[PDB]
RNA sequence: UCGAGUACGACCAUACUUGAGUGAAAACACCAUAUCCCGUCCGAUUUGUGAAGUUAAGCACUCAAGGCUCAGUUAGUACUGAGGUCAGUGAUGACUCGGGAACCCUGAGUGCCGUACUC
């Protein structure tokens, strides 16, 4: 029922004629297909590590599995960009069942309160709280 | 006698130009001279003609800096082709699908080869 799952992505940078194996990059984006979480896989890596989705192959895109339906606290550090004071991140602790749940809700709230939407959202420590 | 030595060169600064160092054989080099062609207002320049001589310059070899060449950044940045019944403002701004710099700075090193001769 909430949309926007969460997927692994990860991938090489086309082994390569000239370091013959570059490094690996994984990283965890929630995204509605596997199609945008590549999309945002390779920008990630054309900034923070200067690879094009061309020079570089996906080596294995996966779907994360769940966590026991169960409620539980959830502080997930986002950062937004907006003419609406460009590039700011934020805490907004969030109070959902799975991650995907309250990673959710953090841009039905960032699109309902800063106009923020996805392509404009980076997401980082989606973890939870105890108390 | 072996690397290089001259003179011919091809790439044309990694080769340039700087302060020096370096020159062991030859070989260039300055060098002697107006005794001739020579044209020098000049024996400077060059152009007759050879070896008392000299590494003083020149020149190649060494290090060791601007500059130059290769790269690491700079930077997936700026910029850009394409696409939005994108967002505001008629300021470009982000996004998506791509291309993708430069100056700089930290580097690397600071020529290479090709024909004849001569040893």
Request: charged residues 30%; positive net charge.
């Amino acid at each position: 029922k909430p949309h926007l799952r969460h997927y692994q992505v990860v991938g090489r940078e086309s082994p390569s004629e000239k370091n013959p194996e570059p490094t690996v990059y994984k990283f965890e984006v929630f995204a509605p297909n596997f199609v945008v979480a590549k999309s945002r896989f390779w920008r990630m890596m054309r900034v923070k590590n200067k690879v094009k989705a061309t020079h570089g192959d996906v080596l294995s895109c996966k779907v994360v599995k769940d966590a026991k339906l169960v409620a539980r606290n959830y502080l997930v550090d986002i950062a937004y960009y907006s003419q609406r004071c460009g590039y700011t991140r934020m805490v907004k602790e969030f109070r959902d069942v799975s991650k995907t749940g309250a990673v959710s809700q953090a841009y039905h709230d960032l699109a309902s309160r800063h106009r923020a939407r996805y392509h404009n959202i980076e997401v980082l420590n989606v973890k939870s709280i105890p108390d």
